Amino acid sequence: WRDGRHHTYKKAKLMKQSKKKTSFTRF
Amino acid sequence: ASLPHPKIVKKHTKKFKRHHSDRYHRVAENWRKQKGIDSVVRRRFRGNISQPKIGYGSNKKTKFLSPSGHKTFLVANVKDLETLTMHTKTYAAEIAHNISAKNRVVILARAKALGIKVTNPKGRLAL
Amino acid sequence: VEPVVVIDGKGHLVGRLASVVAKQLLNGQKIVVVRAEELNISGEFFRNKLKYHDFLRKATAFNKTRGPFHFRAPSRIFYKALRGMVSHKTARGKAALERLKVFEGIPPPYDKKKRVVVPQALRVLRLKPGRKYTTLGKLSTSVGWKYEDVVAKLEAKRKVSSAEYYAKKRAFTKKVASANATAAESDVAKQLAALGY
Amino acid sequence: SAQKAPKWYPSEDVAALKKTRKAARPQKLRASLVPGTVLILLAGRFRGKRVVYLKHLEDNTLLISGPFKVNGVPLRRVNARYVIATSTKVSVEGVNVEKFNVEYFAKEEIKAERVEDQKVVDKALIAEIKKTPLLKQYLSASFSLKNGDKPHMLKF
Amino acid sequence: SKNSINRPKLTSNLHHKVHSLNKKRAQRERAGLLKPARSSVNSKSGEIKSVALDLYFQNKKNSITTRTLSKKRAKKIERNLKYATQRKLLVDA
Amino acid sequence: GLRSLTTVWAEHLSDEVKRRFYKNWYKSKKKAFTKYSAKYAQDGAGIER
Amino acid sequence: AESHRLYVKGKHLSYQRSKRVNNPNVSLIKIEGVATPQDAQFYLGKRIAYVYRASKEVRGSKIRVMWGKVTRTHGNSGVVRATFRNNLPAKTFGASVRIFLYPSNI
RNA sequence: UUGGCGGAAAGGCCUUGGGUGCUUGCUGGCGAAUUGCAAUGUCAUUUGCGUGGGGAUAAAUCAUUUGUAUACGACUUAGA
RNA sequence: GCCCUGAAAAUGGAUGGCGCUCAAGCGUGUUACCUAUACUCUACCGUCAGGGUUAUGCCCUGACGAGUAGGCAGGCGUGGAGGUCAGUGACGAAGCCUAGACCGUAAGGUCGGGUCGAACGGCCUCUAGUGCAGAUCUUGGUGGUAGUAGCAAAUA
RNA sequence: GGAAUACUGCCAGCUGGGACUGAGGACUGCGACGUAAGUCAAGGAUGCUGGCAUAAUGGUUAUAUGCCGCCCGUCUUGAAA
RNA sequence: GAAAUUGUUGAAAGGGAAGGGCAUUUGAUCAGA
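^ inputs. structure came back:
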């Protein structure tokens, strides 16, 4: 990771994507 | 309470509404036959409202029966109530809309004394 | 028999794959197609390029911005072939197409996963030999797809990584099979053999 | 008067029923069900648990014991149509199922009569279960359908 | 859905709507705006439903409504209740 | 297409580019690249990575 | 242990339908691993359940159920006809369904 | 906890060590019961309020102004 | 026998579309399968016919049900009149509102709640200025267009 | 020379699974099984059991989903036009 | 003191019409026994 805030921001983006089901690659 | 009867089935629970009664306010929901010769509803096209016909008629053994199994009889007084002294398992009293609360209590008391079912108690009697 | 099915488009026929996939999505199976650039069509290149030009000259005249949108990529060609099967103008068809994902090449996370085929859509099985066929990357690059040189450069790396993986797995499997062969001849293995394992 | 009167009135005499020619005749159970047969339960508190078959009762039901000791299933009434019958079998000799009838199970904590009967039957049941290898563990285990199991192809 | 074909659109919108509506229903329940079950003591099933008498007994037990009472009707209710309790007392005795 | 995967900025920057980043410069505290300059600390592990 | 399944998984495909007409009273089910009517004859008569979730809790559960029966086969590929006490809502085309093993004839 | 790899949408893969439990590889001992002959019979993030973790202290818009802009919106500049 | 050509223009375009090439095309044969207000069985409604029975009714049996112009029959409803319910009613008449209830195939009828404050219904009959979506219908009322067109001649 | 099998057809042969329906309401009749007694699948379903006893079933209502559905009347051989 | 028409409040739907018929889910509401 880039270790400062990218970690939290990206995991939060991915989990928002996976709860709203708005992800291009993941279902 | 009432008599045993065949299980009630109706063949049409939905109301028969006039065509375009939803489209216009001037056209009311009371049924009126479409006399037009260019009428798809008269010609019975697929995807149109159903029309009333005698095939939808109810069974004679279950006609005029409410779910309690009684035929309704309108009552305005104890004299009209005492017409149904015998017929407690076939008929049920319904107090008329124009009756007052001081007489409704009398009618209900006599109905309790005679063992008659009243269909519309608690009318003007919430106090 | 799975939650999601990954399909390698290599060696397949566009319309037959589209049919089976569509009838699967409308049944509720989630499917992910990869390697659309290696997909195949029956007939010679010339014929299908002519067909795509016939499709490409079609456009709303008074405003081109609102007409048939001619997508050049193989994934989009396959998506068109598929969408023409599905009643995509319904909520049911929309929900069906939202169970699908099409990709040029094998990107993550599907590179680390298993892929399958559809034998009633493969070229080598369905077609008679001595019959010209067409490939979709060539067709799309002819009609204006400007990315075939990156996908090859990336697949050439993916294949090397996968070869390393396979070379490791294959030695592990040799070890396992040898240990099993040594364990064999035991009475437990004889009972298992009797019972069919 | 609001509603005048009807001239006709139906009599309130309700008429008896015609003599119905539908007599109760005893049940014909399928061939697979024979006492001492191991059974799989498909529903209830004990869905998926393997038990044994003991007796057929007057109300079409089946009497079954786990045994309680191994799997935790007591003496119980079970319907035959919610059950799968395995080809596995135990020899029933000496167990006193004569006591148990339909009135035994009428309900109107647990009864000492019940625990007494259950112990005295499942000693004789365990005594014969010990002859076959692994049957204790088989009955202790539960049944489940795995991925790739097709009951129309599966021999039970 | 053509610019992003590998992104779900309608399933996400419907997930949003169902959660949308479920939360609103739960809050309308917490605020006591929906009517209780049939057998609860505060329920009114089989009785007559009239906002006039409801307001009457509420203001006897004594944030914006369309429900008023019409002092005319209030006097009528007091009259008829005096008649009712007169009859009850005549049963009394 | 082409994707940007990282952008690296310098240690010190001018009020001009800070004004470019800002839209009401005369009210702000001008806190634009403070934490980045702090990320330019002893060895610049992040910068070099 | 890891599995407690005592049903078979199936899919609700469609209603009984012609080209331009459908009968919502009858539904079509595709059973996993069943390829022929000779195999579906086993599953005839079996009980069917569609299980869904609501937000409300009505009788101590957010989980609601629609029961039905298998009635007969449909075609040559192992699809069956089914009838429920209440017909399915057509938002379930492509939804999973539980086919229980009772009432058993084994 | 060690170390390495991975940028196509990497968000995952492998590895070192020591703890911590379990182990159906094998043999034993207790408990299950009444969900009453079936009822799917419920088992897989935090936003919100107890929680006290409990410290740190940004911008845009309107109004004003500019005219590289402009029908009005917008745009482009400036102002503690 | 199949295949190519065997002439046909001009918005972009259609074996219905996708698309199909030992076919998802042509010819032929063998099975299985889908499916209509059609056929079979059952129930219910109505009509018609045939029988039975101290009651334009009750019971048994069976066959049938398309429909414009049009014909016949049975019924629902409105204003007023004779009779009757020793009818209803200021503890609330008629009227109006009603996501509430019920009965009839339907016309329509009945009930509950709210508003209102003075007359109104069932039944046996009579009578007619008796039932509306239309008529570039009559009178009255109201909208979208629309805070829109525009309120720019005669020097300020 | 001796059989078998296929094909076609018959059984008032045996057996099993699944679906829909349960009309009618004392008796009367044809019949069958039985030494009788009586019994019976014979002129239309009875028996056993559990759960709930309420918004659960059901109705009404606002929506959604699958399929269908062109705006009425008049005029004319016939029009969405 | 009706309807057309209008405002506020409350609930719901809405990717270039709406309305209607069959069937059910979901939410709200409701009677009988």
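Residues 14, 37-39, 45 of chain E lie near RNA strand J (CB under 10 Å from a C1'). Chains E and F do not touch (no CB pair under 8 Å).
thumbs up if we can close this ticket
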